[PDB]
User: Fold periaxin from Homo sapiens.
Amino acid sequence: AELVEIIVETEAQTGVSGINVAGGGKEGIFVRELREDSPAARSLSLQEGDQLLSARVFFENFKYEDALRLLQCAEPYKVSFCLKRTVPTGD
Amino acid sequence: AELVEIIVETEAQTGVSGINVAGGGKEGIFVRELREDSPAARSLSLQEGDQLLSARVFFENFKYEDALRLLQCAEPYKVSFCLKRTVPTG
Assistant:
């Protein structure tokens, strides 16, 4: 009974990370006040007060500089990658 | 002998640096050089020439300004969040 929390995976979109966030450290990162009627808001997924567990960032059409900056930014933290590779043999 | 393509999601690891990349844009991002002795080369999760489709960054113990810099950096691109929300029961 009592406390129940839903874990949601939002639909990947462009410009949804332009939100404002709060907290940090061991507290966690939470979404602060939603800017008015922006694309990030109008997607029914993201809401004020939500705790962000993780961000999945897609490298599609990425500027090299921005890739470097992103990686540099996430270096000290916990990160997993989704990669495409070519070799044998896993049969 | 026969070459094939695989998509891999690496095991989440904390503090992986030493990843050097090349390319961008319509081409995409590729792993070029794994820095010697870096936690990246000791991770073995990554190989050179591999394309990075996406990076999943965890907000566990994240310092505020770093999270800011991250989201600022990712604004022009495609992003999905994994979030936790409370409900009425529900």
